[PDB]
PDB file of C-alpha atoms and ligand atoms in Angstrom:
ATOM      1  CA  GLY A   1      24.611 -34.871  45.440  1.00  0.00           C
ATOM      2  CA  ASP A   2      21.252 -32.914  44.194  1.00  0.00           C
ATOM      3  CA  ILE A   3      20.045 -33.187  40.958  1.00  0.00           C
ATOM      4  CA  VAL A   4      22.222 -30.019  39.470  1.00  0.00           C
ATOM      5  CA  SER A   5      19.270 -27.382  37.508  1.00  0.00           C
ATOM      6  CA  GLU A   6      19.980 -24.018  36.110  1.00  0.00           C
ATOM      7  CA  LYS A   7      18.845 -20.749  37.847  1.00  0.00           C
ATOM      8  CA  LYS A   8      15.932 -19.324  36.208  1.00  0.00           C
ATOM      9  CA  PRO A   9      16.320 -16.218  35.442  1.00  0.00           C
ATOM     10  CA  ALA A  10      13.801 -13.021  35.346  1.00  0.00           C
ATOM     11  CA  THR A  11      11.301 -14.119  33.238  1.00  0.00           C
ATOM     12  CA  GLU A  12      10.424 -10.416  31.423  1.00  0.00           C
ATOM     13  CA  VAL A  13       7.381 -10.583  29.410  1.00  0.00           C
ATOM     14  CA  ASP A  14       7.863  -8.495  25.544  1.00  0.00           C
ATOM     15  CA  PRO A  15       4.502  -6.512  24.452  1.00  0.00           C
ATOM     16  CA  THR A  16       5.779  -7.794  20.509  1.00  0.00           C
ATOM     17  CA  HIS A  17       6.129 -11.216  20.880  1.00  0.00           C
ATOM     18  CA  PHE A  18       2.562 -13.095  20.405  1.00  0.00           C
ATOM     19  CA  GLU A  19       2.610 -17.125  21.301  1.00  0.00           C
ATOM     20  CA  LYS A  20       0.753 -18.862  18.583  1.00  0.00           C
ATOM     21  CA  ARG A  21      -1.260 -21.103  21.040  1.00  0.00           C
ATOM     22  CA  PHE A  22      -3.615 -17.498  21.496  1.00  0.00           C
ATOM     23  CA  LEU A  23      -3.468 -16.047  18.060  1.00  0.00           C
ATOM     24  CA  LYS A  24      -7.167 -17.332  16.679  1.00  0.00           C
ATOM     25  CA  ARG A  25      -8.166 -17.448  13.280  1.00  0.00           C
ATOM     26  CA  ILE A  26     -11.352 -15.639  12.606  1.00  0.00           C
ATOM     27  CA  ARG A  27     -11.606 -15.151   8.784  1.00  0.00           C
ATOM     28  CA  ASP A  28      -9.052 -13.583   5.680  1.00  0.00           C
ATOM     29  CA  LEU A  29      -8.245 -10.565   5.010  1.00  0.00           C
ATOM     30  CA  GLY A  30      -6.355 -10.643   1.592  1.00  0.00           C
ATOM     31  CA  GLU A  31      -4.280 -12.316  -0.301  1.00  0.00           C
ATOM     32  CA  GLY A  32      -1.882 -13.571  -3.071  1.00  0.00           C
ATOM     33  CA  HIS A  33       0.524 -14.957  -4.429  1.00  0.00           C
ATOM     34  CA  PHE A  34       2.881 -15.553  -1.480  1.00  0.00           C
ATOM     35  CA  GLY A  35       1.947 -14.302   0.857  1.00  0.00           C
ATOM     36  CA  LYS A  36      -2.281 -13.857   3.075  1.00  0.00           C
ATOM     37  CA  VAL A  37      -3.418 -11.358   6.163  1.00  0.00           C
ATOM     38  CA  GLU A  38      -5.972 -13.306   8.155  1.00  0.00           C
ATOM     39  CA  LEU A  39      -7.668 -11.416  11.049  1.00  0.00           C
ATOM     40  CA  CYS A  40      -7.162 -13.344  14.626  1.00  0.00           C
ATOM     41  CA  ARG A  41      -7.521 -12.385  17.889  1.00  0.00           C
ATOM     42  CA  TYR A  42      -4.902 -12.086  20.377  1.00  0.00           C
ATOM     43  CA  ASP A  43      -6.954 -14.369  23.385  1.00  0.00           C
ATOM     44  CA  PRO A  44      -4.346 -15.716  25.925  1.00  0.00           C
ATOM     45  CA  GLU A  45      -7.601 -15.723  28.179  1.00  0.00           C
ATOM     46  CA  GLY A  46      -9.425 -17.628  26.616  1.00  0.00           C
ATOM     47  CA  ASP A  47     -13.008 -16.006  26.840  1.00  0.00           C
ATOM     48  CA  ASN A  48     -12.794 -13.771  23.077  1.00  0.00           C
ATOM     49  CA  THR A  49     -12.566 -10.667  25.365  1.00  0.00           C
ATOM     50  CA  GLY A  50      -8.694 -10.142  23.217  1.00  0.00           C
ATOM     51  CA  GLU A  51      -7.668  -8.123  21.008  1.00  0.00           C
ATOM     52  CA  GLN A  52      -8.081  -8.421  16.863  1.00  0.00           C
ATOM     53  CA  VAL A  53      -5.060  -8.081  14.668  1.00  0.00           C
ATOM     54  CA  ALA A  54      -4.271  -8.452  11.371  1.00  0.00           C
ATOM     55  CA  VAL A  55      -1.812 -11.819  11.043  1.00  0.00           C
ATOM     56  CA  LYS A  56       0.760 -11.357   7.663  1.00  0.00           C
ATOM     57  CA  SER A  57       1.731 -14.995   7.224  1.00  0.00           C
ATOM     58  CA  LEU A  58       3.581 -17.024   4.188  1.00  0.00           C
ATOM     59  CA  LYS A  59       0.935 -19.674   2.383  1.00  0.00           C
ATOM     60  CA  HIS A  66      10.001 -16.755   0.832  1.00  0.00           C
ATOM     61  CA  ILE A  67      10.214 -16.232   4.679  1.00  0.00           C
ATOM     62  CA  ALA A  68      13.565 -13.678   4.118  1.00  0.00           C
ATOM     63  CA  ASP A  69      11.442 -11.393   2.760  1.00  0.00           C
ATOM     64  CA  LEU A  70       8.990 -10.987   5.440  1.00  0.00           C
ATOM     65  CA  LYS A  71      11.318 -11.338   7.607  1.00  0.00           C
ATOM     66  CA  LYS A  72      12.699  -7.722   5.437  1.00  0.00           C
ATOM     67  CA  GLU A  73       9.443  -6.609   5.530  1.00  0.00           C
ATOM     68  CA  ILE A  74       8.932  -6.741   9.122  1.00  0.00           C
ATOM     69  CA  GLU A  75      12.541  -5.117   9.923  1.00  0.00           C
ATOM     70  CA  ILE A  76      10.510  -2.319   7.289  1.00  0.00           C
ATOM     71  CA  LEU A  77       6.830  -1.679   9.354  1.00  0.00           C
ATOM     72  CA  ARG A  78       8.840  -1.468  12.856  1.00  0.00           C
ATOM     73  CA  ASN A  79      10.666   1.342  12.247  1.00  0.00           C
ATOM     74  CA  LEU A  80       8.237   3.233  10.603  1.00  0.00           C
ATOM     75  CA  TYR A  81       6.295   5.800  12.739  1.00  0.00           C
ATOM     76  CA  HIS A  82       3.625   8.032  11.028  1.00  0.00           C
ATOM     77  CA  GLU A  83      -0.204   8.333  11.848  1.00  0.00           C
ATOM     78  CA  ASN A  84      -0.724   7.551   8.207  1.00  0.00           C
ATOM     79  CA  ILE A  85       1.324   4.420   8.452  1.00  0.00           C
ATOM     80  CA  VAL A  86      -0.560   0.976   9.713  1.00  0.00           C
ATOM     81  CA  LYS A  87       1.298  -0.170  12.905  1.00  0.00           C
ATOM     82  CA  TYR A  88       3.251  -2.579  13.916  1.00  0.00           C
ATOM     83  CA  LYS A  89       2.218  -4.483  16.983  1.00  0.00           C
ATOM     84  CA  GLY A  90       4.495  -7.691  16.880  1.00  0.00           C
ATOM     85  CA  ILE A  91       5.582 -11.039  15.563  1.00  0.00           C
ATOM     86  CA  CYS A  92       5.071 -14.595  16.326  1.00  0.00           C
ATOM     87  CA  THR A  93       7.680 -17.660  15.128  1.00  0.00           C
ATOM     88  CA  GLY A  99       8.722 -19.608  10.678  1.00  0.00           C
ATOM     89  CA  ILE A 100       7.760 -15.710  11.584  1.00  0.00           C
ATOM     90  CA  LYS A 101       4.026 -14.013  11.434  1.00  0.00           C
ATOM     91  CA  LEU A 102       3.804 -10.277  11.133  1.00  0.00           C
ATOM     92  CA  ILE A 103       1.068  -8.864  13.659  1.00  0.00           C
ATOM     93  CA  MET A 104      -0.555  -5.526  12.659  1.00  0.00           C
ATOM     94  CA  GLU A 105      -3.111  -3.117  14.065  1.00  0.00           C
ATOM     95  CA  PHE A 106      -6.550  -4.013  12.681  1.00  0.00           C
ATOM     96  CA  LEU A 107      -8.992  -1.371  11.047  1.00  0.00           C
ATOM     97  CA  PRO A 108     -12.563  -2.666  10.733  1.00  0.00           C
ATOM     98  CA  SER A 109     -13.461  -0.477   7.606  1.00  0.00           C
ATOM     99  CA  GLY A 110     -10.805  -2.134   5.597  1.00  0.00           C
ATOM    100  CA  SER A 111      -9.269  -0.738   2.315  1.00  0.00           C
ATOM    101  CA  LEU A 112     -10.112   2.413   0.411  1.00  0.00           C
ATOM    102  CA  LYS A 113     -11.607  -0.501  -1.614  1.00  0.00           C
ATOM    103  CA  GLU A 114     -14.328  -1.834   0.841  1.00  0.00           C
ATOM    104  CA  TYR A 115     -15.261   0.993   2.536  1.00  0.00           C
ATOM    105  CA  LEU A 116     -15.153   3.934  -0.307  1.00  0.00           C
ATOM    106  CA  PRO A 117     -18.053   1.970  -2.042  1.00  0.00           C
ATOM    107  CA  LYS A 118     -20.105   1.558   0.672  1.00  0.00           C
ATOM    108  CA  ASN A 119     -20.084   5.366   2.383  1.00  0.00           C
ATOM    109  CA  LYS A 120     -20.153   7.719  -0.921  1.00  0.00           C
ATOM    110  CA  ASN A 121     -23.162   9.252   0.967  1.00  0.00           C
ATOM    111  CA  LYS A 122     -20.324   9.851   3.610  1.00  0.00           C
ATOM    112  CA  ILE A 123     -17.324  10.659   1.336  1.00  0.00           C
ATOM    113  CA  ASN A 124     -17.169  14.246  -0.648  1.00  0.00           C
ATOM    114  CA  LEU A 125     -14.578  16.018  -2.987  1.00  0.00           C
ATOM    115  CA  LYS A 126     -13.282  17.650   0.621  1.00  0.00           C
ATOM    116  CA  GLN A 127     -12.740  14.221   2.484  1.00  0.00           C
ATOM    117  CA  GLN A 128     -11.380  12.383  -0.845  1.00  0.00           C
ATOM    118  CA  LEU A 129      -8.779  15.377  -1.296  1.00  0.00           C
ATOM    119  CA  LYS A 130      -7.720  14.870   2.900  1.00  0.00           C
ATOM    120  CA  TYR A 131      -6.870  11.273   2.389  1.00  0.00           C
ATOM    121  CA  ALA A 132      -5.149  12.097  -0.644  1.00  0.00           C
ATOM    122  CA  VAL A 133      -3.069  14.799   1.070  1.00  0.00           C
ATOM    123  CA  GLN A 134      -2.555  12.010   3.617  1.00  0.00           C
ATOM    124  CA  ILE A 135      -1.730   8.881   1.226  1.00  0.00           C
ATOM    125  CA  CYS A 136       0.916  12.148   0.777  1.00  0.00           C
ATOM    126  CA  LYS A 137       2.452  12.680   3.761  1.00  0.00           C
ATOM    127  CA  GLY A 138       2.731   8.901   3.960  1.00  0.00           C
ATOM    128  CA  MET A 139       4.503   8.089   1.052  1.00  0.00           C
ATOM    129  CA  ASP A 140       6.660  11.449   1.542  1.00  0.00           C
ATOM    130  CA  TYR A 141       7.812   9.777   4.941  1.00  0.00           C
ATOM    131  CA  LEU A 142       8.771   6.178   3.098  1.00  0.00           C
ATOM    132  CA  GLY A 143      10.770   8.763   0.766  1.00  0.00           C
ATOM    133  CA  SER A 144      12.247  10.158   3.211  1.00  0.00           C
ATOM    134  CA  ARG A 145      13.688   7.265   5.029  1.00  0.00           C
ATOM    135  CA  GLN A 146      15.110   5.857   1.661  1.00  0.00           C
ATOM    136  CA  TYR A 147      12.572   3.843   0.568  1.00  0.00           C
ATOM    137  CA  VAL A 148      10.137   2.834  -2.562  1.00  0.00           C
ATOM    138  CA  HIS A 149       7.319   1.563  -1.858  1.00  0.00           C
ATOM    139  CA  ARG A 150       5.398  -0.170  -5.798  1.00  0.00           C
ATOM    140  CA  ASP A 151       2.862  -1.119  -4.771  1.00  0.00           C
ATOM    141  CA  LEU A 152       0.443   2.114  -3.669  1.00  0.00           C
ATOM    142  CA  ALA A 153      -3.216   0.858  -4.385  1.00  0.00           C
ATOM    143  CA  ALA A 154      -6.463   1.566  -2.657  1.00  0.00           C
ATOM    144  CA  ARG A 155      -6.486  -1.861  -2.194  1.00  0.00           C
ATOM    145  CA  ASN A 156      -3.579  -0.896   0.180  1.00  0.00           C
ATOM    146  CA  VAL A 157      -4.785   1.806   1.699  1.00  0.00           C
ATOM    147  CA  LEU A 158      -6.645   1.073   5.146  1.00  0.00           C
ATOM    148  CA  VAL A 159      -9.528   3.498   6.700  1.00  0.00           C
ATOM    149  CA  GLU A 160      -8.751   4.243  10.717  1.00  0.00           C
ATOM    150  CA  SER A 161     -12.013   7.173  10.247  1.00  0.00           C
ATOM    151  CA  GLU A 162     -13.575   8.330   7.915  1.00  0.00           C
ATOM    152  CA  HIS A 163     -11.063  11.285   8.607  1.00  0.00           C
ATOM    153  CA  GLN A 164      -7.764   9.234   8.505  1.00  0.00           C
ATOM    154  CA  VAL A 165      -5.928   6.513   6.459  1.00  0.00           C
ATOM    155  CA  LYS A 166      -2.915   5.035   6.425  1.00  0.00           C
ATOM    156  CA  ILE A 167      -0.840   3.115   3.764  1.00  0.00           C
ATOM    157  CA  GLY A 168      -1.322  -0.848   5.388  1.00  0.00           C
ATOM    158  CA  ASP A 169       0.925  -3.159   3.299  1.00  0.00           C
ATOM    159  CA  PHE A 170       4.853  -3.021   2.319  1.00  0.00           C
ATOM    160  CA  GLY A 171       5.346  -6.929   0.584  1.00  0.00           C
ATOM    161  CA  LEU A 172       7.434  -5.018  -2.456  1.00  0.00           C
ATOM    162  CA  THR A 173       8.903  -2.336  -0.438  1.00  0.00           C
ATOM    163  CA  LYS A 174      12.382  -2.086  -1.295  1.00  0.00           C
ATOM    164  CA  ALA A 175      15.493   0.543  -0.150  1.00  0.00           C
ATOM    165  CA  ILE A 176      16.920   2.409  -2.455  1.00  0.00           C
ATOM    166  CA  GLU A 177      20.891   2.269  -1.844  1.00  0.00           C
ATOM    167  CA  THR A 178      21.601   6.030  -1.049  1.00  0.00           C
ATOM    168  CA  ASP A 179      23.049   8.048  -3.737  1.00  0.00           C
ATOM    169  CA  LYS A 180      21.870   5.784  -5.842  1.00  0.00           C
ATOM    170  CA  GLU A 181      18.149   7.194  -7.350  1.00  0.00           C
ATOM    171  CA  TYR A 182      16.400   4.159  -8.164  1.00  0.00           C
ATOM    172  CA  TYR A 183      15.961   0.386  -7.736  1.00  0.00           C
ATOM    173  CA  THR A 184      16.271  -2.915  -9.961  1.00  0.00           C
ATOM    174  CA  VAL A 185      13.498  -5.671  -9.832  1.00  0.00           C
ATOM    175  CA  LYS A 186      14.270  -9.156 -10.285  1.00  0.00           C
ATOM    176  CA  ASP A 187      10.757 -10.984  -9.527  1.00  0.00           C
ATOM    177  CA  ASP A 188       8.491  -9.082 -11.391  1.00  0.00           C
ATOM    178  CA  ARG A 189       5.411 -12.333 -12.122  1.00  0.00           C
ATOM    179  CA  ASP A 190       3.138 -11.124 -10.500  1.00  0.00           C
ATOM    180  CA  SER A 191       3.861  -6.279 -11.021  1.00  0.00           C
ATOM    181  CA  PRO A 192       0.207  -4.282 -10.930  1.00  0.00           C
ATOM    182  CA  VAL A 193       1.004  -3.560 -14.514  1.00  0.00           C
ATOM    183  CA  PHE A 194      -1.659  -1.185 -14.340  1.00  0.00           C
ATOM    184  CA  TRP A 195       0.198   0.912 -11.731  1.00  0.00           C
ATOM    185  CA  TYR A 196       3.055   1.057 -13.043  1.00  0.00           C
ATOM    186  CA  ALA A 197       5.354   4.185 -14.400  1.00  0.00           C
ATOM    187  CA  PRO A 198       6.892   3.763 -17.799  1.00  0.00           C
ATOM    188  CA  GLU A 199      10.201   3.058 -16.974  1.00  0.00           C
ATOM    189  CA  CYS A 200       9.277   0.275 -14.299  1.00  0.00           C
ATOM    190  CA  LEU A 201       7.069  -1.508 -17.194  1.00  0.00           C
ATOM    191  CA  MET A 202      10.016  -1.080 -19.912  1.00  0.00           C
ATOM    192  CA  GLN A 203      12.898  -1.633 -17.247  1.00  0.00           C
ATOM    193  CA  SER A 204      12.018  -2.866 -13.592  1.00  0.00           C
ATOM    194  CA  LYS A 205      13.928   0.509 -12.871  1.00  0.00           C
ATOM    195  CA  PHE A 206      11.791   2.028  -9.638  1.00  0.00           C
ATOM    196  CA  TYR A 207      12.456   5.763  -8.575  1.00  0.00           C
ATOM    197  CA  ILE A 208      10.132   7.794  -5.651  1.00  0.00           C
ATOM    198  CA  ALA A 209       8.876   8.908  -8.978  1.00  0.00           C
ATOM    199  CA  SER A 210       7.377   5.722  -9.631  1.00  0.00           C
ATOM    200  CA  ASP A 211       5.598   5.611  -7.026  1.00  0.00           C
ATOM    201  CA  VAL A 212       4.081   8.936  -7.517  1.00  0.00           C
ATOM    202  CA  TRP A 213       3.069   7.650 -10.730  1.00  0.00           C
ATOM    203  CA  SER A 214       1.325   5.000  -9.021  1.00  0.00           C
ATOM    204  CA  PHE A 215      -0.242   7.549  -6.429  1.00  0.00           C
ATOM    205  CA  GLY A 216      -1.932   9.185  -9.844  1.00  0.00           C
ATOM    206  CA  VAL A 217      -3.537   6.296 -10.545  1.00  0.00           C
ATOM    207  CA  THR A 218      -4.415   5.224  -6.744  1.00  0.00           C
ATOM    208  CA  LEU A 219      -5.819   9.011  -6.614  1.00  0.00           C
ATOM    209  CA  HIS A 220      -8.582   7.758  -9.896  1.00  0.00           C
ATOM    210  CA  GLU A 221      -9.393   4.478  -7.725  1.00  0.00           C
ATOM    211  CA  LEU A 222     -10.256   7.182  -4.812  1.00  0.00           C
ATOM    212  CA  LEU A 223     -12.034   9.800  -7.185  1.00  0.00           C
ATOM    213  CA  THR A 224     -14.576   6.864  -8.906  1.00  0.00           C
ATOM    214  CA  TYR A 225     -14.708   5.371  -5.294  1.00  0.00           C
ATOM    215  CA  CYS A 226     -13.115   1.824  -6.494  1.00  0.00           C
ATOM    216  CA  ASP A 227     -15.440   1.055  -8.586  1.00  0.00           C
ATOM    217  CA  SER A 228     -14.975  -2.132  -9.872  1.00  0.00           C
ATOM    218  CA  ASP A 229     -16.166  -1.378 -13.538  1.00  0.00           C
ATOM    219  CA  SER A 230     -14.013   1.852 -13.250  1.00  0.00           C
ATOM    220  CA  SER A 231     -11.061   0.272 -12.082  1.00  0.00           C
ATOM    221  CA  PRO A 232      -7.369   0.931 -13.835  1.00  0.00           C
ATOM    222  CA  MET A 233      -7.462  -2.669 -15.194  1.00  0.00           C
ATOM    223  CA  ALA A 234     -11.257  -2.367 -16.677  1.00  0.00           C
ATOM    224  CA  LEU A 235     -10.185   0.897 -17.829  1.00  0.00           C
ATOM    225  CA  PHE A 236      -6.768   0.391 -19.481  1.00  0.00           C
ATOM    226  CA  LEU A 237      -8.387  -2.677 -21.487  1.00  0.00           C
ATOM    227  CA  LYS A 238     -10.695  -0.631 -22.761  1.00  0.00           C
ATOM    228  CA  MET A 239      -8.338   1.117 -23.959  1.00  0.00           C
ATOM    229  CA  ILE A 240      -5.738  -1.128 -25.187  1.00  0.00           C
ATOM    230  CA  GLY A 241      -7.981  -4.578 -25.594  1.00  0.00           C
ATOM    231  CA  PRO A 242      -9.096  -7.363 -23.135  1.00  0.00           C
ATOM    232  CA  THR A 243      -7.008 -10.639 -25.221  1.00  0.00           C
ATOM    233  CA  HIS A 244      -4.390  -9.999 -25.440  1.00  0.00           C
ATOM    234  CA  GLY A 245      -2.338 -12.324 -23.559  1.00  0.00           C
ATOM    235  CA  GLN A 246       1.045 -11.911 -22.843  1.00  0.00           C
ATOM    236  CA  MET A 247       1.597  -8.644 -25.113  1.00  0.00           C
ATOM    237  CA  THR A 248      -0.932  -6.641 -22.769  1.00  0.00           C
ATOM    238  CA  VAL A 249       1.901  -5.362 -21.272  1.00  0.00           C
ATOM    239  CA  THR A 250       3.496  -4.742 -24.305  1.00  0.00           C
ATOM    240  CA  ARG A 251       0.720  -2.902 -25.828  1.00  0.00           C
ATOM    241  CA  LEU A 252      -0.060  -0.510 -22.460  1.00  0.00           C
ATOM    242  CA  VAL A 253       3.732   0.196 -22.790  1.00  0.00           C
ATOM    243  CA  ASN A 254       3.367   1.615 -26.425  1.00  0.00           C
ATOM    244  CA  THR A 255      -0.490   3.221 -25.171  1.00  0.00           C
ATOM    245  CA  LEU A 256       1.437   5.556 -22.847  1.00  0.00           C
ATOM    246  CA  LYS A 257       4.170   5.925 -25.108  1.00  0.00           C
ATOM    247  CA  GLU A 258       1.284   7.409 -27.684  1.00  0.00           C
ATOM    248  CA  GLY A 259       0.490  10.316 -24.440  1.00  0.00           C
ATOM    249  CA  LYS A 260      -2.850   8.658 -23.373  1.00  0.00           C
ATOM    250  CA  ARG A 261      -4.121   7.938 -20.179  1.00  0.00           C
ATOM    251  CA  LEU A 262      -6.539   7.095 -17.750  1.00  0.00           C
ATOM    252  CA  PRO A 263      -9.836   9.384 -17.949  1.00  0.00           C
ATOM    253  CA  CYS A 264     -11.374  11.821 -16.084  1.00  0.00           C
ATOM    254  CA  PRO A 265     -13.966  10.693 -13.071  1.00  0.00           C
ATOM    255  CA  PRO A 266     -16.983  12.067 -13.640  1.00  0.00           C
ATOM    256  CA  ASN A 267     -17.514  14.879 -11.070  1.00  0.00           C
ATOM    257  CA  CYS A 268     -13.819  15.288 -10.479  1.00  0.00           C
ATOM    258  CA  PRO A 269     -12.522  19.047 -10.951  1.00  0.00           C
ATOM    259  CA  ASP A 270     -10.675  19.841 -13.580  1.00  0.00           C
ATOM    260  CA  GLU A 271      -8.007  21.075 -11.532  1.00  0.00           C
ATOM    261  CA  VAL A 272      -7.740  17.782  -9.576  1.00  0.00           C
ATOM    262  CA  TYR A 273      -7.332  15.901 -12.945  1.00  0.00           C
ATOM    263  CA  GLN A 274      -4.017  18.115 -13.574  1.00  0.00           C
ATOM    264  CA  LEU A 275      -2.724  17.394 -10.267  1.00  0.00           C
ATOM    265  CA  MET A 276      -3.484  13.663 -11.367  1.00  0.00           C
ATOM    266  CA  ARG A 277      -1.264  14.209 -14.388  1.00  0.00           C
ATOM    267  CA  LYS A 278       1.392  15.373 -13.672  1.00  0.00           C
ATOM    268  CA  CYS A 279       1.470  12.186 -12.030  1.00  0.00           C
ATOM    269  CA  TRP A 280       1.713  11.188 -15.165  1.00  0.00           C
ATOM    270  CA  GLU A 281       4.670  12.313 -17.569  1.00  0.00           C
ATOM    271  CA  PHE A 282       6.421   9.887 -19.279  1.00  0.00           C
ATOM    272  CA  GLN A 283       9.821  10.923 -17.769  1.00  0.00           C
ATOM    273  CA  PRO A 284      10.221  10.342 -14.450  1.00  0.00           C
ATOM    274  CA  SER A 285      12.025  13.744 -13.861  1.00  0.00           C
ATOM    275  CA  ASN A 286       9.040  15.687 -15.609  1.00  0.00           C
ATOM    276  CA  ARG A 287       6.807  14.561 -12.939  1.00  0.00           C
ATOM    277  CA  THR A 288       5.291  16.487  -9.604  1.00  0.00           C
ATOM    278  CA  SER A 289       6.513  15.695  -5.866  1.00  0.00           C
ATOM    279  CA  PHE A 290       4.656  14.375  -2.876  1.00  0.00           C
ATOM    280  CA  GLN A 291       5.279  17.701  -1.432  1.00  0.00           C
ATOM    281  CA  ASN A 292       4.364  19.514  -4.252  1.00  0.00           C
ATOM    282  CA  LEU A 293       0.918  17.488  -4.664  1.00  0.00           C
ATOM    283  CA  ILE A 294       0.304  17.752  -0.379  1.00  0.00           C
ATOM    284  CA  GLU A 295       0.584  21.794  -1.765  1.00  0.00           C
ATOM    285  CA  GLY A 296      -1.508  21.330  -4.365  1.00  0.00           C
ATOM    286  CA  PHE A 297      -4.616  19.540  -2.246  1.00  0.00           C
ATOM    287  CA  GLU A 298      -4.353  21.890   0.358  1.00  0.00           C
ATOM    288  CA  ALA A 299      -4.540  25.229  -1.639  1.00  0.00           C
ATOM    289  CA  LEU A 300      -7.794  23.274  -3.538  1.00  0.00           C
ATOM    290  CA  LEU A 301      -8.906  22.659   0.794  1.00  0.00           C
ATOM    291  CA  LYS A 302      -8.516  26.361   1.338  1.00  0.00           C
TER     292      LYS A 302
HETATM  293  C1  0Q2 B 401      -9.056  -5.683   3.318  1.00  0.00           C
HETATM  294  C2  0Q2 B 401      -7.681  -5.462   4.901  1.00  0.00           C
HETATM  295  N1  0Q2 B 401      -8.558  -4.987   5.849  1.00  0.00           N
HETATM  296  C3  0Q2 B 401      -7.525  -4.784   7.224  1.00  0.00           C
HETATM  297  C4  0Q2 B 401      -8.113  -4.260   8.078  1.00  0.00           C
HETATM  298  N2  0Q2 B 401      -6.353  -4.196   8.811  1.00  0.00           N
HETATM  299  C5  0Q2 B 401      -5.492  -4.290   8.899  1.00  0.00           C
HETATM  300  C6  0Q2 B 401      -5.634  -4.705   7.100  1.00  0.00           C
HETATM  301  C7  0Q2 B 401      -6.384  -4.980   6.538  1.00  0.00           C
HETATM  302  N3  0Q2 B 401      -6.876  -5.149   4.672  1.00  0.00           N
HETATM  303  C8  0Q2 B 401      -6.173  -5.971   3.857  1.00  0.00           C
HETATM  304  C9  0Q2 B 401      -4.799  -6.421   4.386  1.00  0.00           C
HETATM  305  C10 0Q2 B 401      -4.354  -7.488   3.172  1.00  0.00           C
HETATM  306  C11 0Q2 B 401      -3.198  -6.215   2.470  1.00  0.00           C
HETATM  307  C12 0Q2 B 401      -3.553  -5.287   2.082  1.00  0.00           C
HETATM  308  O1  0Q2 B 401      -5.018  -4.899   1.171  1.00  0.00           O
HETATM  309  C13 0Q2 B 401      -4.853  -4.129   3.316  1.00  0.00           C
HETATM  310  C14 0Q2 B 401      -3.656  -5.051   6.499  1.00  0.00           C
HETATM  311  C15 0Q2 B 401      -3.509  -4.709   7.800  1.00  0.00           C
HETATM  312  N4  0Q2 B 401      -4.457  -4.343   8.667  1.00  0.00           N
END
């Protein structure tokens, strides 16, 4: 008889599925090593009216898929929104036009006083506490990974190194560590590549320092540390860092930072993880300073 085709089923539209043919690149937002994030417009009508989105791709497939599964199931006002995927696979996120603290703080000093800084600090802590409650370690908390939604709101905006801590275990052991942000890392991470929730508290301390210096490049943790230890030690750098930290030396108080803010910061940097403050205690500390 007649050619037998297949009865077409009712094709619903998934709002989390972005078609590659309509995803149009505008510019690069950031990158390094294995992955990159690009600003695109998803423009299915082809008239330049479509939504702008942040697209994370690979320059490692399984890592990105894990990252996508983590972000997709995180819901918090201080965590960047998952929008969908393009399938190889690309992670589609909301685009925050003010960028990260790295871009925004140098340009908005007149706008952002100590009060607004402590409010960001509180919001970064709330996000991180949420992540910790879901049994995750972030491993990459730095100002460049903190996005500005508005003058009054920040969100944690990249989860590429985030790992799950096994239930009834205190830490995660890392193998791939070539490209570690060592000037943000707690001693136990540098020495044994173990990562506690308290190690994120340490990194938070260093992120708070960056906030307080408005992410000035000449006051960056890397810059300040390389002054403390020496900028020309090559592969001996990390060991000299570990050594300086053992001796009890820490980043200095930022200019115009009240001692009471600086002490909250120093509690992030107790050498022993069990001696460090928690995110909830940081929150309480900042809120007491705020009112
Ligand atoms: C610099 C920057 N601007 C962003 C706007 N929206 C975003 C993201 C943005 N980023 C960085 C991209 C690379 C990783 C992070 O440093 C953030 C990321 C996600 N949405």
